[PDB]
Design a protein around this nucleic acid. Structure first.
Lengths: 56, 305, 49, 45
DNA sequence: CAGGTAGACGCGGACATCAAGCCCGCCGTGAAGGTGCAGCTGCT
DNA sequence: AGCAGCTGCACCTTCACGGCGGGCTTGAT
C-alpha cells in the first residue's frame, strides 16, 4: 500500500491499524506471581476503545 | 412487561472519578449495569414510601473525559494511578492499576406506579432529586452544584395525559432539554446479521465483534469500507460458570442470606445515537433479564427496532 | 456543631470552601502530579506531568 | 578565492597554526585573525 | 409654525525570469513480588 | 519442656514487541 498506489500491483492481503489501545499491567515487575500465561505476555491486557463521540 | 406512565427527568449531573476500565477487553464509558443498579438503589431507598416503581434509564453522556497519557514513541496509552499508603515497616505497596474518568450525564427514568395522584405532581420529582444527590453512579461521587449562575430543576412529564399534538409538543419540549448529548443503545440483531454475512464457509464467532471496531483501511484498489455510525463493544451482562450454591455454603460471601454463583463477562455491541432521530422517548430504556436457572444475567434496551 | 449535626444522620451538609493565598507576582503554584509508570523511550519523554 | 585546493583558506591555515605549530606568512595571519573577528561556528566533527 | 416632486449612472486588454536553503554536542534515578518452610523466642 | 506465633530467606519467568496517515457522530430557538 505504500509504494504501489499508482500501480495496479496490489497483493491479495491487507492490514489493520487498531487506534487508541490501552495497556494494563497486572504483575508489577514479577508477573509470574499471577499466573503462567501472564508471564508469556507481560501485563499488556490491550484494552479496546469504546468511547462516546464529542458533540463539536 | 412494563411501559412507563410518566417520565422523570433529572438534570445534568456530574461525576468526578468514575470507573474507566469496564471489562477485561474494553475501556472507556462505564457499563449500563451500573446505571441499572443505581436506579434499583433509588427504588429501594425512595420508591417504597411513595408507592412508585422506578424502572428504566436512558443514558445521555453530555461529556466524557479520561485520565490517560500516551508514552513517547508509542501509539498506545497508559493510565494515571494513585499512591496508596505503605504496607508496614516503610515498604511501598504493590500497585494495582485502575482507571478513572469525569462524566457529565443526565438521565431520564420512567415511573409507572399508581401512587401518583392529583395533588403530588412536582414534589415527587423533588423528593427523588434530593435523594439522588447523596449517592454515586459508577464509583464516582455526584457533584452537588454549589453557588453558580443558574440552577437546573427536574421534570415530571406525564405520557398519556394530553392530546396527540400536545403529546408531540411534550416530546419536543423534553427532547430540547437533552439535545447536545448522545444516547447509548444495544444493537444485537445487527451483530447477528453481520455474523450471518461474514460466515462464508469459515467458522468464527468473536472476531466478528473485532471486525466492526477496527479501521479497515485495506482493500484492493486503497479503499476504506465504512460502518453505520459509532459502533462500540460493551459489557452486556454475565454468564454462569458454577451451579448455584445455597445461601450459607460459600466461604467469605458478601452476605449469608443470598445464593451465590460464579459468573463471567459477556460482550455485545452498541451505538451512540442522537436523541432527535428516534421519535420515541418511551424507548431508550434499559432493563434486566435474568433467567435464574441457566445463568445469562443480561440487560438490554427492548422495544427499540 | 453543624458538621456534627450532619454526621448524626439528620442532614447531609453541603459546604463550599474558598481559600486565598498571597504569593507574589509571577511566582510558581504547585498542582498535583500524576503517577505515570511507563514513560516510553528516551529523546521525547517528559518526566513531569 | 581561497579554495581548498590551493591551501590558503582559513580552515587549512588555522589547523596548520594551532595544531602543528607552523605559522603562515603575516598576511594570511591577518586573514585568519580577521576571520576570528568576524565570528561563526568553526567546529569540527 | 410650515420644509418638493422625477429619471438615469459605459465599454476593452494585458499581470515577468534566475539562483541558491548550516554545522556541533548531549536526553536522570530512587520505590512500587507471592508463597512455603526453617528456625527462634515467649508462654502454659 | 511443648504447641502457637512471628521473622528471615530461597525459589521462580521472561529482550521493547512497527509508523507518512487510517473510522463513525453535531439541533433548533
Amino acid at each position: 500500500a505504500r509504494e504501489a498506489r499508482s500501480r495496479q500491483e496490489s497483493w491479495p492481503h491487507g492490514f489493520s491499524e487498531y487506534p487508541n489501545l490501552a495497556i494494563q499491567k497486572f504483575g508489577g515487575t514479577k508477573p509470574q506471581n499471577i499466573s503462567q500465561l501472564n508471564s508469556e505476555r507481560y501485563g499488556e491486557n490491550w484494552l479496546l476503545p469504546s468511547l462516546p463521540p464529542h458533540w463539536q | 412487561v412494563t411501559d412507563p406512565e410518566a417520565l422523570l427527568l433529572l438534570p445534568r449531573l456530574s461525576i468526578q472519578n468514575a470507573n474507566a476500565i469496564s471489562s477485561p477487553l474494553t475501556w472507556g464509558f462505564p457499563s449500563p449495569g451500573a446505571f441499572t443498579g443505581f436506579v434499583h438503589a433509588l427504588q429501594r431507598r425512595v420508591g417504597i414510601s411513595l408507592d412508585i416503581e422506578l424502572d428504566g434509564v436512558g443514558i445521555v453522556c453530555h461529556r466524557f473525559e479520561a485520565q490517560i497519557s500516551q508514552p513517547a514513541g508509542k501509539r498506545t496509552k497508559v493510565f494515571n494511578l494513585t499512591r496508596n499508603p505503605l504496607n508496614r515497616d516503610g515498604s511501598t505497596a504493590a500497585i494495582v492499576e485502575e482507571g478513572r474518568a469525569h462524566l457529565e450525564v443526565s438521565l431520564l427514568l420512567g415511573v409507572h406506579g399508581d401512587g401518583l395522584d392529583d395533588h403530588p405532581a412536582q414534589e415527587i420529582a423533588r423528593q427523588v432529586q434530593e435523594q439522588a444527590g447523596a449517592m454515586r453512579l459508577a464509583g464516582g461521587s455526584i457533584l452537588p452544584w454549589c453557588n453558580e449562575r443558574f440552577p437546573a430543576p427536574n421534570a415530571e412529564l406525564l405520557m398519556l395525559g394530553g392530546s396527540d399534538e400536545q403529546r408531540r409538543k411534550n416530546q419536543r419540549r423534553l427532547t430540547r432539554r437533552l439535545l447536545p448529548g448522545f444516547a447509548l443503545v444495544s444493537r444485537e440483531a445487527l451483530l447477528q446479521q453481520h455474523l450471518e454475512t461474514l460466515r462464508t464457509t469459515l467458522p468464527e464467532a468473536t472476531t466478528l465483534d473485532a471486525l466492526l471496531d477496527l479501521c479497515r483501511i485495506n482493500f484492493e484498489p486503497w479503499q476504506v469500507r465504512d460502518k453505520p455510525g459509532w459502533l462500540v463493544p460493551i459489557p452486556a451482562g454475565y454468564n454462569a460458570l458454577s451451579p448455584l450454591y445455597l445461601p450459607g455454603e460459600v466461604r467469605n460471601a458478601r452476605d449469608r442470606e443470598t445464593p451465590l454463583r460464579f459468573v463471567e463477562n459477556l460482550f455485545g455491541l452498541g451505538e451512540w445515537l442522537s436523541p432527535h432521530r428516534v421519535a420515541a422517548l418511551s424507548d431508550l430504556l434499559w432493563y434486566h433479564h435474568a433467567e435464574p436457572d441457566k445463568g445469562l444475567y443480561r440487560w438490554s434496551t427492548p422495544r427499540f427496532v | 456543631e453543624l458538621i456534627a449535626s450532619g454526621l448524626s444522620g439528620s442532614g447531609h451538609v453541603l459546604l463550599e470552601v474558598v481559600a486565598f493565598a498571597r504569593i507574589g507576582d509571577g511566582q510558581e503554584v504547585f498542582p498535583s502530579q500524576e503517577l505515570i509508570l511507563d514513560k516510553g523511550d528516551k529523546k521525547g519523554q517528559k518526566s513531569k506531568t | 578565492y581561497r579554495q581548498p585546493k590551493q591551501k590558503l583558506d582559513f580552515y587549512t591555515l588555522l589547523d596548520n597554526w594551532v595544531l602543528r605549530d607552523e605559522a603562515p606568512a603575516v598576511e594570511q595571519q591577518h586573514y585568519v585573525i580577521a576571520n576570528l573577528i568576524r565570528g561563526g561556528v568553526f567546529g569540527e566533527a
